[PDB]
Amino acid sequence: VKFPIRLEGLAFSHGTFSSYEPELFPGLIYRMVKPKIVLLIFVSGKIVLTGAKQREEIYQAFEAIYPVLSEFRKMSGSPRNLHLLPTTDTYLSKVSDDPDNLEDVDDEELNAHL
DNA sequence: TTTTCAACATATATTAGTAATACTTTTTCTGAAGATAAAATGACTCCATGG
């Protein structure tokens, strides 16, 4: 997010959905059930997000929680559209789903990988 | 020489999927004086044979 984040009050507020342990690991652990993703948090605002099977769920959680990020700040802005890029199944379809299509997608380098 | 850097690296935590092994647990599951008595003491007697 390119701005600092105060975690000590973050979990102290959201620790129902969050956890913060100074000893083990520097940042904060966040638990979101809706959708179900764990959000790994730091001081600088660099946020690592996983525990998701779906690309859309990422921007879902990141989106919904970003107002919590703007909530806790010390002294971008516009989400634009919630979903911009094509869905996941589009890029899954960009590759042949048929189990028997291989030699067509064979890189020809695997012919050299023997 | 010493100090600051740096730097290298490596855990550290998440979320998975396995799969397999090893490893701890847990949960069965058994292998003070004067009555009261108990017994040893002893006499009594039934009852044995024999001259």
Side-chain angles (χ1 to χ4, degrees), chain A residues 45-88:
Chain A
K46 295 177 69 67
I47 304 303
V48 177
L49 185 146
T50 184
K53 292 179 178 179
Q54 187 63 260
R55 179 183 293 175
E56 290 78 355
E57 295 175 350
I58 295 169
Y59 304 139
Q60 294 177 338
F62 173 80
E63 177 65 16
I65 192 166
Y66 180 77
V68 178
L69 299 174
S70 297
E71 180 179 1
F72 298 156
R73 294 178 65 183
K74 292 182 179 296
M75 181 176 284
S76 296
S78 178
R80 189 170 293 106
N81 188 29
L82 303 178
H83 183 199
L84 292 173
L85 296 175
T87 61
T88 298

mmCIF file of all heavy atoms in Angstrom, chain A residues 45-88:
data_model
loop_
_atom_site.group_PDB
_atom_site.id
_atom_site.type_symbol
_atom_site.label_atom_id
_atom_site.label_comp_id
_atom_site.label_asym_id
_atom_site.label_seq_id
_atom_site.Cartn_x
_atom_site.Cartn_y
_atom_site.Cartn_z
ATOM 1 N N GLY A 45 3.497 -1.814 5.079
ATOM 2 C CA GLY A 45 2.292 -1.885 4.277
ATOM 3 C C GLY A 45 2.360 -2.883 3.146
ATOM 4 O O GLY A 45 1.368 -3.041 2.421
ATOM 5 N N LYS A 46 3.486 -3.562 2.956
ATOM 6 C CA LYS A 46 3.596 -4.648 1.986
ATOM 7 C C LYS A 46 2.751 -5.795 2.519
ATOM 8 O O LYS A 46 2.911 -6.234 3.659
ATOM 9 C CB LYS A 46 5.053 -5.049 1.800
ATOM 10 C CG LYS A 46 5.910 -3.957 1.177
ATOM 11 C CD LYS A 46 7.371 -4.355 1.072
ATOM 12 C CE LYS A 46 7.589 -5.442 0.045
ATOM 13 N NZ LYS A 46 7.322 -4.964 -1.336
ATOM 14 N N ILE A 47 1.821 -6.273 1.701
ATOM 15 C CA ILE A 47 0.864 -7.276 2.155
ATOM 16 C C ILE A 47 0.934 -8.496 1.250
ATOM 17 O O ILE A 47 0.752 -8.394 0.031
ATOM 18 C CB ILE A 47 -0.557 -6.697 2.189
ATOM 19 C CG1 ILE A 47 -0.599 -5.441 3.055
ATOM 20 C CG2 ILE A 47 -1.540 -7.745 2.696
ATOM 21 C CD1 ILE A 47 -0.116 -5.660 4.463
ATOM 22 N N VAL A 48 1.186 -9.654 1.849
ATOM 23 C CA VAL A 48 1.217 -10.927 1.142
ATOM 24 C C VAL A 48 -0.116 -11.609 1.422
ATOM 25 O O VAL A 48 -0.576 -11.654 2.566
ATOM 26 C CB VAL A 48 2.403 -11.788 1.581
ATOM 27 C CG1 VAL A 48 2.364 -13.141 0.893
ATOM 28 C CG2 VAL A 48 3.714 -11.070 1.293
ATOM 29 N N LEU A 49 -0.746 -12.144 0.377
ATOM 30 C CA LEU A 49 -2.084 -12.720 0.494
ATOM 31 C C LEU A 49 -2.118 -14.069 -0.216
ATOM 32 O O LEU A 49 -1.781 -14.203 -1.392
ATOM 33 C CB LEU A 49 -3.123 -11.757 -0.068
ATOM 34 C CG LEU A 49 -4.591 -12.151 0.092
ATOM 35 C CD1 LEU A 49 -5.440 -10.913 0.297
ATOM 36 C CD2 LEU A 49 -5.088 -12.930 -1.122
ATOM 37 N N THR A 50 -2.554 -15.084 0.520
ATOM 38 C CA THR A 50 -2.756 -16.415 -0.021
ATOM 39 C C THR A 50 -3.742 -17.185 0.847
ATOM 40 O O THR A 50 -4.367 -16.634 1.757
ATOM 41 C CB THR A 50 -1.437 -17.180 -0.128
ATOM 42 O OG1 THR A 50 -1.669 -18.446 -0.760
ATOM 43 C CG2 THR A 50 -0.846 -17.391 1.242
ATOM 44 N N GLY A 51 -3.859 -18.479 0.567
ATOM 45 C CA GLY A 51 -4.933 -19.264 1.136
ATOM 46 C C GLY A 51 -6.203 -19.058 0.345
ATOM 47 O O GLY A 51 -7.306 -19.028 0.899
ATOM 48 N N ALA A 52 -6.044 -18.905 -0.966
ATOM 49 C CA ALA A 52 -7.150 -18.687 -1.884
ATOM 50 C C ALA A 52 -7.002 -19.616 -3.077
ATOM 51 O O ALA A 52 -5.904 -19.777 -3.616
ATOM 52 C CB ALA A 52 -7.203 -17.231 -2.361
ATOM 53 N N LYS A 53 -8.109 -20.233 -3.478
ATOM 54 C CA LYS A 53 -8.151 -21.033 -4.691
ATOM 55 C C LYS A 53 -8.589 -20.233 -5.905
ATOM 56 O O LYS A 53 -8.604 -20.774 -7.014
ATOM 57 C CB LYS A 53 -9.095 -22.226 -4.516
ATOM 58 C CG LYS A 53 -8.631 -23.276 -3.532
ATOM 59 C CD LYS A 53 -9.667 -24.383 -3.431
ATOM 60 C CE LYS A 53 -9.218 -25.490 -2.498
ATOM 61 N NZ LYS A 53 -10.256 -26.550 -2.379
ATOM 62 N N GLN A 54 -8.942 -18.962 -5.730
ATOM 63 C CA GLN A 54 -9.574 -18.208 -6.799
ATOM 64 C C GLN A 54 -8.953 -16.822 -6.890
ATOM 65 O O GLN A 54 -8.777 -16.144 -5.874
ATOM 66 C CB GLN A 54 -11.083 -18.105 -6.561
ATOM 67 C CG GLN A 54 -11.836 -17.489 -7.707
ATOM 68 C CD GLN A 54 -11.728 -18.325 -8.963
ATOM 69 O OE1 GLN A 54 -10.936 -18.025 -9.852
ATOM 70 N NE2 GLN A 54 -12.518 -19.389 -9.037
ATOM 71 N N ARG A 55 -8.628 -16.411 -8.119
ATOM 72 C CA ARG A 55 -8.016 -15.103 -8.336
ATOM 73 C C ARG A 55 -8.942 -13.969 -7.922
ATOM 74 O O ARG A 55 -8.481 -12.967 -7.361
ATOM 75 C CB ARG A 55 -7.623 -14.947 -9.804
ATOM 76 C CG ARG A 55 -7.005 -13.602 -10.147
ATOM 77 C CD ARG A 55 -6.714 -13.499 -11.634
ATOM 78 N NE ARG A 55 -5.670 -14.428 -12.054
ATOM 79 C CZ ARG A 55 -5.292 -14.603 -13.316
ATOM 80 N NH1 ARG A 55 -5.876 -13.916 -14.285
ATOM 81 N NH2 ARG A 55 -4.331 -15.467 -13.609
ATOM 82 N N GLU A 56 -10.239 -14.104 -8.195
ATOM 83 C CA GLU A 56 -11.193 -13.069 -7.812
ATOM 84 C C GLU A 56 -11.251 -12.883 -6.304
ATOM 85 O O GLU A 56 -11.338 -11.746 -5.831
ATOM 86 C CB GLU A 56 -12.579 -13.408 -8.359
ATOM 87 C CG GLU A 56 -12.701 -13.292 -9.870
ATOM 88 C CD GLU A 56 -12.106 -14.479 -10.606
ATOM 89 O OE1 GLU A 56 -11.511 -15.360 -9.954
ATOM 90 O OE2 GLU A 56 -12.233 -14.529 -11.844
ATOM 91 N N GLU A 57 -11.198 -13.978 -5.541
ATOM 92 C CA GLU A 57 -11.230 -13.875 -4.086
ATOM 93 C C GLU A 57 -10.128 -12.967 -3.561
ATOM 94 O O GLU A 57 -10.321 -12.279 -2.553
ATOM 95 C CB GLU A 57 -11.108 -15.265 -3.467
ATOM 96 C CG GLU A 57 -12.278 -16.180 -3.771
ATOM 97 C CD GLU A 57 -12.059 -17.585 -3.250
ATOM 98 O OE1 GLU A 57 -10.927 -17.887 -2.821
ATOM 99 O OE2 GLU A 57 -13.016 -18.387 -3.274
ATOM 100 N N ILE A 58 -8.974 -12.956 -4.232
ATOM 101 C CA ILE A 58 -7.896 -12.045 -3.865
ATOM 102 C C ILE A 58 -8.396 -10.608 -3.856
ATOM 103 O O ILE A 58 -8.389 -9.936 -2.820
ATOM 104 C CB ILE A 58 -6.706 -12.214 -4.824
ATOM 105 C CG1 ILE A 58 -6.110 -13.612 -4.680
ATOM 106 C CG2 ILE A 58 -5.658 -11.146 -4.568
ATOM 107 C CD1 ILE A 58 -5.107 -13.957 -5.752
ATOM 108 N N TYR A 59 -8.834 -10.118 -5.014
ATOM 109 C CA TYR A 59 -9.266 -8.732 -5.112
ATOM 110 C C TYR A 59 -10.508 -8.476 -4.271
ATOM 111 O O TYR A 59 -10.741 -7.340 -3.842
ATOM 112 C CB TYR A 59 -9.508 -8.386 -6.577
ATOM 113 C CG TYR A 59 -8.289 -8.660 -7.428
ATOM 114 C CD1 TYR A 59 -8.407 -9.232 -8.687
ATOM 115 C CD2 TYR A 59 -7.015 -8.377 -6.953
ATOM 116 C CE1 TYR A 59 -7.290 -9.495 -9.459
ATOM 117 C CE2 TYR A 59 -5.896 -8.637 -7.714
ATOM 118 C CZ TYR A 59 -6.037 -9.193 -8.966
ATOM 119 O OH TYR A 59 -4.919 -9.451 -9.726
ATOM 120 N N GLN A 60 -11.317 -9.510 -4.035
ATOM 121 C CA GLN A 60 -12.405 -9.396 -3.072
ATOM 122 C C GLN A 60 -11.877 -9.007 -1.700
ATOM 123 O O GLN A 60 -12.196 -7.927 -1.188
ATOM 124 C CB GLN A 60 -13.177 -10.712 -2.986
ATOM 125 C CG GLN A 60 -13.922 -11.084 -4.250
ATOM 126 C CD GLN A 60 -14.615 -12.425 -4.135
ATOM 127 O OE1 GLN A 60 -14.241 -13.260 -3.312
ATOM 128 N NE2 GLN A 60 -15.627 -12.641 -4.965
ATOM 129 N N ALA A 61 -11.069 -9.877 -1.091
ATOM 130 C CA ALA A 61 -10.556 -9.613 0.248
ATOM 131 C C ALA A 61 -9.745 -8.327 0.303
ATOM 132 O O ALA A 61 -10.047 -7.446 1.116
ATOM 133 C CB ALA A 61 -9.712 -10.793 0.726
ATOM 134 N N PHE A 62 -8.715 -8.209 -0.541
ATOM 135 C CA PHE A 62 -7.918 -6.989 -0.606
ATOM 136 C C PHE A 62 -8.793 -5.750 -0.719
ATOM 137 O O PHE A 62 -8.586 -4.774 0.013
ATOM 138 C CB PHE A 62 -6.958 -7.059 -1.792
ATOM 139 C CG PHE A 62 -6.212 -5.782 -2.046
ATOM 140 C CD1 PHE A 62 -5.104 -5.450 -1.287
ATOM 141 C CD2 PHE A 62 -6.615 -4.918 -3.051
ATOM 142 C CE1 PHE A 62 -4.414 -4.277 -1.523
ATOM 143 C CE2 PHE A 62 -5.929 -3.745 -3.290
ATOM 144 C CZ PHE A 62 -4.828 -3.424 -2.525
ATOM 145 N N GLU A 63 -9.767 -5.778 -1.625
ATOM 146 C CA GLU A 63 -10.723 -4.688 -1.740
ATOM 147 C C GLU A 63 -11.417 -4.389 -0.423
ATOM 148 O O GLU A 63 -11.268 -3.286 0.107
ATOM 149 C CB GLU A 63 -11.766 -5.010 -2.809
ATOM 150 C CG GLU A 63 -12.835 -3.943 -2.941
ATOM 151 C CD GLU A 63 -12.297 -2.611 -3.434
ATOM 152 O OE1 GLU A 63 -11.164 -2.572 -3.958
ATOM 153 O OE2 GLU A 63 -13.009 -1.596 -3.287
ATOM 154 N N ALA A 64 -12.177 -5.348 0.112
ATOM 155 C CA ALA A 64 -12.980 -5.110 1.305
ATOM 156 C C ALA A 64 -12.153 -4.653 2.497
ATOM 157 O O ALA A 64 -12.623 -3.814 3.273
ATOM 158 C CB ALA A 64 -13.752 -6.376 1.675
ATOM 159 N N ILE A 65 -10.948 -5.188 2.678
ATOM 160 C CA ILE A 65 -10.113 -4.823 3.814
ATOM 161 C C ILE A 65 -9.367 -3.517 3.596
ATOM 162 O O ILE A 65 -8.987 -2.869 4.585
ATOM 163 C CB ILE A 65 -9.118 -5.948 4.174
ATOM 164 C CG1 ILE A 65 -8.474 -5.674 5.535
ATOM 165 C CG2 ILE A 65 -8.041 -6.058 3.111
ATOM 166 C CD1 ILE A 65 -7.741 -6.858 6.120
ATOM 167 N N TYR A 66 -9.147 -3.104 2.349
ATOM 168 C CA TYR A 66 -8.455 -1.840 2.123
ATOM 169 C C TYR A 66 -9.097 -0.664 2.853
ATOM 170 O O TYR A 66 -8.350 0.230 3.283
ATOM 171 C CB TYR A 66 -8.346 -1.547 0.624
ATOM 172 C CG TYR A 66 -7.643 -0.240 0.360
ATOM 173 C CD1 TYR A 66 -6.263 -0.146 0.460
ATOM 174 C CD2 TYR A 66 -8.355 0.903 0.032
ATOM 175 C CE1 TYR A 66 -5.609 1.046 0.231
ATOM 176 C CE2 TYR A 66 -7.709 2.103 -0.199
ATOM 177 C CZ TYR A 66 -6.336 2.167 -0.099
ATOM 178 O OH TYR A 66 -5.684 3.356 -0.330
ATOM 179 N N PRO A 67 -10.423 -0.570 3.002
ATOM 180 C CA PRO A 67 -10.970 0.480 3.874
ATOM 181 C C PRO A 67 -10.509 0.378 5.314
ATOM 182 O O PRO A 67 -10.468 1.397 6.012
ATOM 183 C CB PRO A 67 -12.484 0.279 3.754
ATOM 184 C CG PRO A 67 -12.667 -0.290 2.413
ATOM 185 C CD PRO A 67 -11.478 -1.172 2.172
ATOM 186 N N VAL A 68 -10.181 -0.822 5.796
ATOM 187 C CA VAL A 68 -9.563 -0.928 7.110
ATOM 188 C C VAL A 68 -8.154 -0.356 7.064
ATOM 189 O O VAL A 68 -7.681 0.258 8.030
ATOM 190 C CB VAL A 68 -9.572 -2.391 7.591
ATOM 191 C CG1 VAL A 68 -8.875 -2.523 8.935
ATOM 192 C CG2 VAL A 68 -10.997 -2.917 7.658
ATOM 193 N N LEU A 69 -7.468 -0.533 5.936
ATOM 194 C CA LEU A 69 -6.142 0.049 5.773
ATOM 195 C C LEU A 69 -6.206 1.569 5.794
ATOM 196 O O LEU A 69 -5.451 2.218 6.524
ATOM 197 C CB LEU A 69 -5.519 -0.444 4.470
ATOM 198 C CG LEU A 69 -5.321 -1.958 4.409
ATOM 199 C CD1 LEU A 69 -4.849 -2.386 3.033
ATOM 200 C CD2 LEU A 69 -4.345 -2.406 5.485
ATOM 201 N N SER A 70 -7.103 2.154 4.998
ATOM 202 C CA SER A 70 -7.326 3.590 5.053
ATOM 203 C C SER A 70 -7.816 4.032 6.422
ATOM 204 O O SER A 70 -7.555 5.172 6.822
ATOM 205 C CB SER A 70 -8.330 4.006 3.979
ATOM 206 O OG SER A 70 -7.826 3.729 2.685
ATOM 207 N N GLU A 71 -8.512 3.154 7.147
ATOM 208 C CA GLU A 71 -8.942 3.479 8.500
ATOM 209 C C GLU A 71 -7.756 3.693 9.426
ATOM 210 O O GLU A 71 -7.735 4.663 10.191
ATOM 211 C CB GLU A 71 -9.839 2.370 9.052
ATOM 212 C CG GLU A 71 -10.336 2.627 10.466
ATOM 213 C CD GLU A 71 -11.237 1.521 10.978
ATOM 214 O OE1 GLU A 71 -11.452 0.538 10.238
ATOM 215 O OE2 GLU A 71 -11.727 1.633 12.123
ATOM 216 N N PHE A 72 -6.765 2.808 9.374
ATOM 217 C CA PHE A 72 -5.588 2.916 10.224
ATOM 218 C C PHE A 72 -4.447 3.453 9.368
ATOM 219 O O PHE A 72 -3.823 2.727 8.595
ATOM 220 C CB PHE A 72 -5.254 1.562 10.828
ATOM 221 C CG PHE A 72 -6.332 1.019 11.718
ATOM 222 C CD1 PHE A 72 -6.433 -0.341 11.951
ATOM 223 C CD2 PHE A 72 -7.256 1.866 12.307
ATOM 224 C CE1 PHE A 72 -7.430 -0.845 12.764
ATOM 225 C CE2 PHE A 72 -8.252 1.367 13.123
ATOM 226 C CZ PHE A 72 -8.339 0.009 13.352
ATOM 227 N N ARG A 73 -4.142 4.732 9.563
ATOM 228 C CA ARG A 73 -3.065 5.444 8.894
ATOM 229 C C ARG A 73 -2.608 6.578 9.798
ATOM 230 O O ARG A 73 -3.321 7.003 10.712
ATOM 231 C CB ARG A 73 -3.501 5.994 7.524
ATOM 232 C CG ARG A 73 -3.823 4.929 6.487
ATOM 233 C CD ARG A 73 -4.303 5.509 5.169
ATOM 234 N NE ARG A 73 -3.273 6.287 4.489
ATOM 235 C CZ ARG A 73 -3.470 6.944 3.350
ATOM 236 N NH1 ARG A 73 -4.659 6.912 2.762
ATOM 237 N NH2 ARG A 73 -2.479 7.628 2.795
ATOM 238 N N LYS A 74 -1.403 7.069 9.543
ATOM 239 C CA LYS A 74 -0.827 8.123 10.358
ATOM 240 C C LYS A 74 -0.373 9.274 9.477
ATOM 241 O O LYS A 74 0.162 9.077 8.382
ATOM 242 C CB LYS A 74 0.341 7.603 11.199
ATOM 243 C CG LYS A 74 -0.088 6.632 12.279
ATOM 244 C CD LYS A 74 1.090 6.191 13.124
ATOM 245 C CE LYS A 74 0.653 5.243 14.232
ATOM 246 N NZ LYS A 74 -0.271 5.887 15.213
ATOM 247 N N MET A 75 -0.601 10.484 9.978
ATOM 248 C CA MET A 75 -0.197 11.710 9.300
ATOM 249 C C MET A 75 0.363 12.720 10.297
ATOM 250 O O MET A 75 1.570 12.770 10.531
ATOM 251 C CB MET A 75 -1.374 12.327 8.540
ATOM 252 C CG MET A 75 -1.026 13.606 7.786
ATOM 253 S SD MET A 75 -2.407 14.245 6.820
ATOM 254 C CE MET A 75 -2.400 13.108 5.437
ATOM 255 N N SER A 76 -3.997 2.523 -4.507
ATOM 256 C CA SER A 76 -4.116 3.973 -4.424
ATOM 257 C C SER A 76 -5.336 4.352 -3.599
ATOM 258 O O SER A 76 -5.682 3.668 -2.638
ATOM 259 C CB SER A 76 -4.210 4.592 -5.821
ATOM 260 O OG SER A 76 -3.026 4.366 -6.565
ATOM 261 N N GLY A 77 -5.979 5.453 -3.970
ATOM 262 C CA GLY A 77 -7.204 5.857 -3.312
ATOM 263 C C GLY A 77 -8.451 5.276 -3.947
ATOM 264 O O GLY A 77 -9.473 5.103 -3.277
ATOM 265 N N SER A 78 -8.379 4.966 -5.242
ATOM 266 C CA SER A 78 -9.579 4.578 -5.978
ATOM 267 C C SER A 78 -9.516 3.106 -6.372
ATOM 268 O O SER A 78 -8.586 2.701 -7.079
ATOM 269 C CB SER A 78 -9.747 5.429 -7.228
ATOM 270 O OG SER A 78 -10.882 5.021 -7.972
ATOM 271 N N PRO A 79 -10.477 2.288 -5.937
ATOM 272 C CA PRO A 79 -10.524 0.890 -6.387
ATOM 273 C C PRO A 79 -10.847 0.726 -7.862
ATOM 274 O O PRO A 79 -10.658 -0.377 -8.394
ATOM 275 C CB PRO A 79 -11.630 0.283 -5.515
ATOM 276 C CG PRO A 79 -12.513 1.437 -5.186
ATOM 277 C CD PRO A 79 -11.592 2.615 -5.031
ATOM 278 N N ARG A 80 -11.329 1.779 -8.528
ATOM 279 C CA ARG A 80 -11.780 1.706 -9.913
ATOM 280 C C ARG A 80 -12.871 0.644 -10.005
ATOM 281 O O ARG A 80 -13.929 0.791 -9.385
ATOM 282 C CB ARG A 80 -10.600 1.422 -10.854
ATOM 283 C CG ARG A 80 -10.914 1.524 -12.345
ATOM 284 C CD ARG A 80 -9.646 1.475 -13.188
ATOM 285 N NE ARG A 80 -8.800 2.648 -12.979
ATOM 286 C CZ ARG A 80 -7.667 2.643 -12.283
ATOM 287 N NH1 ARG A 80 -7.234 1.521 -11.724
ATOM 288 N NH2 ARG A 80 -6.966 3.760 -12.148
ATOM 289 N N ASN A 81 -12.639 -0.427 -10.760
ATOM 290 C CA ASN A 81 -13.583 -1.528 -10.817
ATOM 291 C C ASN A 81 -13.073 -2.669 -9.952
ATOM 292 O O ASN A 81 -11.867 -2.901 -9.851
ATOM 293 C CB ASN A 81 -13.815 -2.023 -12.249
ATOM 294 C CG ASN A 81 -14.942 -3.034 -12.338
ATOM 295 O OD1 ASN A 81 -15.880 -3.003 -11.541
ATOM 296 N ND2 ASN A 81 -14.856 -3.937 -13.306
ATOM 297 N N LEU A 82 -14.014 -3.373 -9.321
ATOM 298 C CA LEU A 82 -13.646 -4.488 -8.458
ATOM 299 C C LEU A 82 -12.983 -5.606 -9.247
ATOM 300 O O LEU A 82 -11.996 -6.190 -8.786
ATOM 301 C CB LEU A 82 -14.883 -5.016 -7.734
ATOM 302 C CG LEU A 82 -15.638 -3.987 -6.890
ATOM 303 C CD1 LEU A 82 -16.867 -4.619 -6.255
ATOM 304 C CD2 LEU A 82 -14.742 -3.341 -5.846
ATOM 305 N N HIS A 83 -13.510 -5.919 -10.428
ATOM 306 C CA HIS A 83 -12.937 -6.942 -11.293
ATOM 307 C C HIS A 83 -12.596 -6.303 -12.630
ATOM 308 O O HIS A 83 -13.480 -5.774 -13.309
ATOM 309 C CB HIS A 83 -13.901 -8.113 -11.492
ATOM 310 C CG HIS A 83 -13.335 -9.222 -12.321
ATOM 311 N ND1 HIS A 83 -14.122 -10.173 -12.934
ATOM 312 C CD2 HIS A 83 -12.055 -9.539 -12.627
ATOM 313 C CE1 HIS A 83 -13.352 -11.022 -13.591
ATOM 314 N NE2 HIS A 83 -12.092 -10.660 -13.420
ATOM 315 N N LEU A 84 -11.320 -6.354 -13.003
ATOM 316 C CA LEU A 84 -10.848 -5.819 -14.274
ATOM 317 C C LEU A 84 -10.401 -6.908 -15.235
ATOM 318 O O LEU A 84 -10.997 -7.067 -16.306
ATOM 319 C CB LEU A 84 -9.698 -4.829 -14.036
ATOM 320 C CG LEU A 84 -10.054 -3.515 -13.342
ATOM 321 C CD1 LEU A 84 -8.798 -2.725 -13.021
ATOM 322 C CD2 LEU A 84 -10.972 -2.705 -14.236
ATOM 323 N N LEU A 85 -9.362 -7.659 -14.882
ATOM 324 C CA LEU A 85 -8.811 -8.659 -15.779
ATOM 325 C C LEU A 85 -9.801 -9.807 -15.987
ATOM 326 O O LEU A 85 -10.762 -9.954 -15.229
ATOM 327 C CB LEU A 85 -7.497 -9.197 -15.219
ATOM 328 C CG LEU A 85 -6.352 -8.188 -15.107
ATOM 329 C CD1 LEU A 85 -5.148 -8.818 -14.426
ATOM 330 C CD2 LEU A 85 -5.973 -7.650 -16.480
ATOM 331 N N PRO A 86 -9.597 -10.622 -17.023
ATOM 332 C CA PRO A 86 -10.463 -11.790 -17.223
ATOM 333 C C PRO A 86 -10.393 -12.756 -16.049
ATOM 334 O O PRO A 86 -9.479 -12.713 -15.222
ATOM 335 C CB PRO A 86 -9.906 -12.429 -18.500
ATOM 336 C CG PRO A 86 -9.296 -11.294 -19.239
ATOM 337 C CD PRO A 86 -8.721 -10.388 -18.185
ATOM 338 N N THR A 87 -11.385 -13.640 -15.987
ATOM 339 C CA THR A 87 -11.483 -14.571 -14.878
ATOM 340 C C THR A 87 -10.396 -15.639 -14.972
ATOM 341 O O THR A 87 -9.594 -15.679 -15.907
ATOM 342 C CB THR A 87 -12.859 -15.236 -14.849
ATOM 343 O OG1 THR A 87 -13.067 -15.962 -16.066
ATOM 344 C CG2 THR A 87 -13.953 -14.195 -14.695
ATOM 345 N N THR A 88 -10.387 -16.527 -13.976
ATOM 346 C CA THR A 88 -9.398 -17.598 -13.947
ATOM 347 C C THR A 88 -9.700 -18.660 -14.994
ATOM 348 O O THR A 88 -8.790 -19.137 -15.683
ATOM 349 C CB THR A 88 -9.346 -18.222 -12.553
ATOM 350 O OG1 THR A 88 -8.935 -17.236 -11.598
ATOM 351 C CG2 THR A 88 -8.381 -19.393 -12.520
#
